[PDB]
């Protein structure tokens, strides 16, 4: 089977709506994807939907002969890590704890897939609330609802389908629990301190109303610290701090879904570390390769919680061992090469460039925003947004859309300023064409 | 980190309730797991919860130098297969279609995890029923319920938590949809043709009652063709044939969950092929490494179904590319070495041995049963079952429990008769000790 026949073969069995290229697995590297049909190189601001930390074939992985043998040992088989342990697994777990761990959140759980990571966070919370209720004289049948935001994206699985509300395509015709949803008080351009504070008070009022009308029945509040798929919507630390206090008031856990914000993209291990809010549970995925949760804080107040009692949480595999081995090497590179700090520095550079774009194209490049390497801007209409993406594709720059009118940048942590300049140069080229 | 410190390290972060061994990734092979602490070899009738087709480090994979390079290419990165295609992916898809495909079920979809494979089958069905309703003058808000069996195990995710009903530990304190559940008319010892037929009529009556009291609202019937975790419970082809007809009568899809029965274990690619019942959707996982669904039959009667319309089903990764590359090699070995037929022959041998056990230990070894290599027997009490498992562990034979009093055998397809004899010899040793 030849590169030029890939779309043909796949097309017999599946819907083929992805990119026009065929990925060259060997010749792609760093911030470039190589199309195996033409050999054209594509500048990557997309990173497998923000799931690659270092880009393709990073040198510290490719040149590492000891690592090759470790990866191969892992890749040949697929053990059930949930009941068969190995040195390979333990090395990953201890380096995850070292590089990404939070002392307040010592309980780790691993699974394949981001939706299921969020779900295990939720299951942790339902169990917690039911047992916390029970211990305090309240009916243990209560504690089954999840407070969440408009524009949230948490996945496409049984539970997360009740939370996700972006495109109706994702959720239409699928059965949902009726869980309380509140407005998202995200930063928008041209709203000052008190204008922002008023918008937050309104979400807080909605959250508080939800807590009082479903007493003892809300198990947790879930949020993306920055909403990704919904359109790169950022929130002031003030909002989550108030939510944190409101959650404690009503004995409900605070879960951050860091599947997209996690693993150094915003400049720190986790976005919540910059918002100065302590969560009880963190769901991770994408760049971590293996997905899962970190839990602690109030979770430990219930002694027979989901992390202390056998067989409450499980999967056949407990995550992919190959993902585990790759991820620990990735983490070791992040740690040794200072890549969180590099994301801070380079994220400031990218942001500055988008501010310059906004100045030169004031009615077109709207609302430049970002935290670390997680950056975006908006266009006036969705037709303009889609056209800008097509135009960038023709210039061999891969970016992702989000929401109705956002273009998001998701470079690897290893992106250089020259690579950023080239991405920006391509946007300057395409803009007069869209206007 | 050393083999003897694995349990210590893991224990700081997670609950450590798996096996006492540390898996030697390199020295394990075929039907033997090697403990890296002592070097003791363990006879494997467990196969990573039935998820390994060929056992550890199969020679056709280990000695294949071209395959090594392909695996390594795949293992170094983790592309989003859902939007970035590759030769590696297309080779897997076409060999899956060739070795395991069904002409009636041409739509393939891939995901990480068995629970999510079942869920995508369900989502396919909810969508189908809503659109089929709509096209026939019925409210499209109807079609949200799943008919299913007692003792069923379909996973631990949002939707499958409403279906799974084995141990209360798996499902307690988690929110569920109230979906119709019916009795499971499995074969039990000492019930003849009419006794069996009466028991089936009763489940059929319950199924029919469910259809008539929730009109147009049941989207599908799900079943394991042989119930695994619930205790290796087999059903006569007569039962599923009648269910097939009843499903057509009420315009509902028939989904087989073949995550455990699939990929040659019962002697054929799929168990349903031996029961002579055509499903509309098949969910697969475990031995396939990548999980997912095959769909067709009545699914194609709705032209804008989930397989024809973009973005209705998705995940970030669309399955693990490393799993895809490994699995196609596994499939090529199954095909070239005639391993389905070998499962038929060796499964007959194992069954015969369990019949001999039943004859020599008539009050202890109860209800020997199997299809292909999927075999089991029961003890009088669960205390006896647990003791037999402990005793076998001491003799270095790994088997799994199921249900209240079942011991299940899950050998690789490559098991030899000598290996079976050794497993049986160990059971004969342990039995007088348990009695
Ligand atoms: C591991 C358990 C099965 C369970 C635990 C080990 C021994 C006996 N079983 C009750 C279920 C597993 C297949 C799963 C996980 C996540 C989503 C879906 C499904
Ligand atoms: C791939 C989509 C996201 C979606 C499709 C591609 C472009 C824009 N998005 C609306 C959701 C995905 C993260 C997922 C899958 C399975 C379970 C949970 C979550
Ligand atoms: C294994 C199993 C599943 C769930 O698989 P996971 O990969 O652990 O999520 C679903 N159905 C059946 C019949 C199973 O054996
Ligand atoms: C990616 C995403 C998920 C779902 O991840 P999958 O691996 O595709 O299931 C959940 N939450 C957020 C915020 C995401 O970005």
Swiss-Prot record, chains A, B:
Gene3D superfamilies: Aspartate Aminotransferase, domain 1, Type I PLP-dependent aspartate aminotransferase-like (Major domain). It catalyses: L-lysine + 2-oxoglutarate = (S)-2-amino-6-oxohexanoate + L-glutamate. GO terms for molecular function: L-lysine 6-transaminase activity; pyridoxal phosphate binding. PROSITE patterns: AA_TRANSFER_CLASS_3. 2-oxoglutarate binds at residues 156, 260, 408. Pfam families: Aminotran_3 (PF00202). The modification N6-(pyridoxal phosphate)lysine is found at residue 286. The keyword Transferase applies. Its EC number is 2.6.1.36. Its cofactor is pyridoxal 5'-phosphate. L-lysine binds at residue 156. Keywords: Aminotransferase, Pyridoxal phosphate, Transferase. It comes from the Bacteria. The keyword Cell membrane does not apply. Pyridoxal 5'-phosphate binds at residues 114-115, 260. One of its GO terms (biological process) is gamma-aminobutyric acid catabolic process. PANTHER family: 4-AMINOBUTYRATE AMINOTRANSFERASE GABT, AMINOTRANSFERASE. Belongs to the class-III pyridoxal-phosphate-dependent aminotransferase family. Catalyzes the transfer of the terminal amino group of L-lysine to alpha-ketoglutarate to yield L-glutamate and 2-aminoadipate 6-semialdehyde ((S)-2-amino-6-oxohexanoate), which is spontaneously converted to the dehydrated form 1-piperideine 6-carboxylate. This is L-lysine-epsilon aminotransferase. It comes from Mycobacterium tuberculosis (strain CDC 1551 / Oshkosh).
């Amino acid at each position: 089977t030849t590169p030029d026949r890939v779309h043909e073969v796949l097309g017999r069995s599946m819907l083929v709506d992805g990119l026009d290229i065929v990925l060259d697995l060997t010749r792609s590297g760093g911030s470039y994807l190589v199309d195996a049909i033409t050999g054209r190189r594509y500048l990557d601001m997309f990173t497998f939907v923000a799931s690659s930390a270092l880009g393709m074939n990073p040198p510290a992985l490719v040149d590492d002969r000891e690592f090759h043998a470790e990866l191969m040992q892992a890749a040949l088989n697929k053990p059930s890590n949930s009941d068969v342990y190995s040195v390979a697994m333990a090395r990953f777990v201890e380096t995850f704890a070292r590089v990404l761990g939070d002392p307040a959140l010592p309980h780790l759980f691993f699974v394949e897939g981001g939706a299921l990571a969020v779900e295990n966070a939720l299951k942790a919370a339902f169990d917690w609330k039911s047992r916390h209720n029970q211990a305090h004289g309240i009916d243990p049948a209560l504690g089954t609802q999840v407070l969440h935001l408009r524009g949230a994206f948490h996945g496409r699985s049984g539970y997360t389908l009740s939370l996700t509300n972006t495109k109706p395509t994702i959720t239409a015709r699928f059965p949902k629990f009726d869980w309380p949803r509140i407005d998202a008080p995200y930063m928008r351009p041209g709203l000052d301190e008190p204008a922002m504070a008023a918008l937050e008070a309104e979400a807080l009022r909605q959250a508080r109303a939800a807590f009082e009308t479903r007493p003892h029945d809300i198990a947790c509040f879930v949020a993306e610290p920055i909403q990704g798929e919904g359109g790169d919507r950022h929130f002031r630390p003030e909002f989550f701090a108030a939510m944190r206090e409101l959650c404690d008031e009503f004995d409900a856990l605070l879960i951050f879904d860091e599947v997209q914000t996690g693993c150094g993209l915003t400049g720190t291990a986790w976005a919540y570390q910059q918002l100065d809010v302590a969560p009880d549970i963190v769901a991770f995925g994408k760049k971590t390769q293996v997905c899962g949760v970190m839990a602690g804080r109030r979770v430990d107040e219930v002694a027979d919680n989901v992390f202390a009692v056998p067989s409450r949480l499980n999967s056949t595999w407990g995550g992919n061992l190959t993902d585990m081995v790759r991820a620990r090497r990735i983490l070791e590179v992040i740690e040794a090469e200072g890549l969180f700090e590099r994301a801070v520095q380079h994220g400031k550079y990218l942001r500055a460039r988008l501010d310059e774009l906004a100045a030169d194209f004031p009615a077109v490049v709207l609302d430049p925003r970002g935290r670390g390497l997680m950056c975006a801007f908006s266009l006036p209409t969705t037709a303009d947004r889609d056209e800008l993406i097509r135009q960038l594709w023709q210039r061999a720059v891969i970016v992702l859309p989000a929401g109705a009118d956002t273009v998001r940048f998701r470079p690897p942590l290893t992106v250089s300023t020259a690579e950023i300049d080239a991405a920006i140069a391509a946007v300057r080229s395409a803009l007069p064409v869209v206007t």
